Amino acid sequence: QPEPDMITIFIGTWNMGNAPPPKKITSWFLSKGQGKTRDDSADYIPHDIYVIGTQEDPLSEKEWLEILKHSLQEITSVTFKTVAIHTLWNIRIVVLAKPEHENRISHICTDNVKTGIANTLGNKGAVGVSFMFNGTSLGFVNSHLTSGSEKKLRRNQNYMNILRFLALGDKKLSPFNITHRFTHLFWFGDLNYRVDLPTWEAETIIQKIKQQQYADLLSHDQLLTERREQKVFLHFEEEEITFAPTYRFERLTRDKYAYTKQKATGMKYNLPSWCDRVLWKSYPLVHVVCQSYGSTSDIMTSDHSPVFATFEAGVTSQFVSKNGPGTVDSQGQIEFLRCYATLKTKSQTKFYLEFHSSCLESFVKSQEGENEEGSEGELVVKFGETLPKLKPIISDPEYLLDQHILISIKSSDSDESYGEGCIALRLEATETQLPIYTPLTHHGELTGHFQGEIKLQTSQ
Ligand SMILES: C[C@@H](Oc1ccc(C#N)cc1)C(N)=O
């Protein structure tokens, strides 16, 4: 039985509005309703992995697991295995996988982050799951961010706290936050970003939604605008939105948006908004294709509609050679030429690099670089031809060209990372000097750039 080189992943996010679901929710898992929907001809084909995020979930873990598993069994005739379930307050993530994947999945991690302080600590935050699927690391974050049209900055702060403090994936990757630890990272939830138009325009907005004319609404979506200004979700992708706003509906119909201020809303307007979202970030030159992104039309227990997204995601096998794992393979090497880091920092310490990759027996520290002044005020750290030669565990190009090197640039004085990035080994050529490039981030904010050349030797 061959190991897969592709799997399909279902991502669901639903704010349940503290109400039990209806008896049938299969349309959610089938990607049926509005937006980019799944072909009918696929309905019996199970996804490999289903990741379900809920917010304002009133059910016990047991109650929801019974509904989920029984739903997927009705659709696919497959009894899914529970990979992980984690709940913080009313925020929950469930990971289910086809039974054939049970012995491909390992290193399962769960964590949560509570956002805010005092007043603002008590119901918002995130839950997450990570695991290895054969040679591929997968991370999943379900977040319920701060509500309210005038709190986009709070939401951006909630995002930064979640990506700093959520402890998933390989702890040996100590300089790297979740935005660098996974081949594929999926971040979804009730992110609570709103359509930022005047309150007086409520009925106009509703009109536009009834005509399926979303362009003038999406141009005011706070998540799109904040992402465009690099305030949040830097280097993440989102599929084009082609479904109606998923909040705020009158319960038990989808015919009505309930936007007017009420005691129950703290006297806040809830203009129709795309609160409920799915974004991803994959390592460079890994296959990832969004095959659905939409909302259901027939699940009306909540003031939110469920959102679905599905993905084709490239995976690799758990590779064994005569040599590595357990030793190096001297027919392989990774060389770096003419490399330099450009940093935004106003500080003056020496810097060194750390290289981390599962293709190495352990991480590698460089010598310190040479600081120079850039012509526009910047710090340029020159490594020239001084970087160590990296010794991969396996030299076979079928393995090595699928790997990635994580780079941290660290202060000699503090050993704190000033920037993190990733380089793909999926090169156009081996034994050839080729340009490489990654942006550098720290706490998910842009802090600089790393560029230079690479020379990769494989056994072929
Ligand atoms: C840590 C956990 O391992 C698992 C659980 C579920 C799957 C699946 N599918 C694979 C591995 C355990 N000890 O049960």
**Cβ–Cβ under 8 Å, residues 393 and 325:** yes
Identity of the residue numbered 311: F
| Distance from C-alpha of 336 to C-alpha of 339, rounded to nearest angstrom | 7
CA 105 / ligand 1 centre spacing (Å): 7
Dihedral of CA 339/344/350/351: which sign? negative
| Distance from C-alpha of 13 to C-alpha of 186, rounded to nearest angstrom | 11
**CB 102 less than 6 A from any atom of ligand 1:** yes
| Distance from C-alpha of 110 to C-alpha of 169, rounded to nearest angstrom | 9
| Distance from C-alpha of 14 to C-alpha of 148, rounded to nearest angstrom | 18
Identity of the residue numbered 260: T
**CB 132 less than 6 A from any atom of ligand 1:** no
| Distance from C-alpha of 5 to C-alpha of 99, rounded to nearest angstrom | 18
| Distance from C-alpha of 351 to C-alpha of 335, rounded to nearest angstrom | 19
Dihedral of CA 309/134/93/444: which sign? negative
Q: Where do the DSSP E strands lie in 220-300?
A: 276-282, 288-295
User: How far, CA to CA in Å, does 250 sit from each of 124, 199, 255, 299, 353?
Assistant: 23, 18, 8, 12, 55
**Residue 407 burial (C-beta neighbours within 10 Å; 0-12, 13-18, 19+):** buried
Atom of ligand 1 nearest to the CA of 83: 6
Nearest to 232 by CA among 146, 324, 343: 146
In sequence order, which residues have a C-beta less than 8 Å from that of residue 205 and are 6 or more positions away? 195, 197, 217, 271, 272
In the chain, the N- to C-terminal Cα span, in Å, equals 27
**Cβ–Cβ under 8 Å, residues 293 and 35:** yes
CA 82 / ligand 1 centre spacing (Å): 7
Structure tokens at 296: 């259901």
The three-state DSSP-derived secondary structure of 160-187 is HHHHHHCCCCCCCCCCCCHHHHCCEEEE
Identity of the residue numbered 173: L
Structure tokens at 41: 């001809």
**What SS3 state is found at 44?**
coil
**Cβ–Cβ under 8 Å, residues 396 and 425:** no
CA 98 / ligand 1 centre spacing (Å): 12
Sheet with 125-133, edge to edge strand ranges: 105-114, 125-133, 136-144, 184-190, 276-282
Atom of ligand 1 nearest to the CA of 81: 9
**Cβ–Cβ under 8 Å, residues 381 and 341:** yes
> Hey, whose CA ends up nearest to atom 8 of ligand 1?
102
Nearest to 90 by CA among 63, 57, 113: 57
Half-sphere exposure for 360 (CA within 13 Å, toward CB):
19
Backbone φ, ψ for residue 265 (5° rounding): -105, 15
Q: Is the peptide bond before 248 cis (omega within 30 degrees of 0)?
A: yes
Structure tokens at 193: 């970003």
| Distance from C-alpha of 321 to C-alpha of 150, rounded to nearest angstrom | 56
Structure tokens at 283: 């390592």
> Hey, whose CA ends up nearest to atom 14 of ligand 1?
83
**Cβ–Cβ under 8 Å, residues 187 and 143:** yes
**CB 83 less than 6 A from any atom of ligand 1:** yes
> What technique was this entry resolved by?
X-ray
**CB 97 less than 6 A from any atom of ligand 1:** yes
CA 83 / ligand 1 centre spacing (Å): 5
Sheet with 91-97, edge to edge strand ranges: 34-36, 288-295, 307-314, 6-15, 49-55, 91-97, 81-88
Identity of the residue numbered 47: H
**CB 268 less than 6 A from any atom of ligand 1:** no
Dihedral of CA 428/431/434/438: which sign? positive
> Hey, whose CA ends up nearest to atom 9 of ligand 1?
102
**What SS3 state is found at 71?**
helix
**CB 101 less than 6 A from any atom of ligand 1:** yes
Structure tokens at 385: 């031809």
Structure tokens at 87: 């709940």
CB atoms within 10 A of CB 75: 14
Nearest to 162 by CA among 219, 221, 83, 236: 236
| Distance from C-alpha of 259 to C-alpha of 149, rounded to nearest angstrom | 12
**Residue 170 burial (C-beta neighbours within 10 Å; 0-12, 13-18, 19+):** middle
**CB 105 less than 6 A from any atom of ligand 1:** yes
CA 133 / ligand 1 centre spacing (Å): 11
In angstroms, what is the resolution?
A: 1.6
Pair type for strands 288-295 and 417-424: unpaired
Q: Is the peptide bond before 284 cis (omega within 30 degrees of 0)?
A: no
CA 106 / ligand 1 centre spacing (Å): 7
In sequence order, which residues have a C-beta less than 8 Å from that of residue 113 and are 6 or more positions away? 125, 126, 161, 162, 165, 166
| Distance from C-alpha of 260 to C-alpha of 299, rounded to nearest angstrom | 22
In sequence order, which residues have a C-beta less than 8 Å from that of residue 301 and are 6 or more positions away? 16, 17, 19, 20, 21, 22, 251, 252
**CB 100 less than 6 A from any atom of ligand 1:** no
**CB 85 less than 6 A from any atom of ligand 1:** no
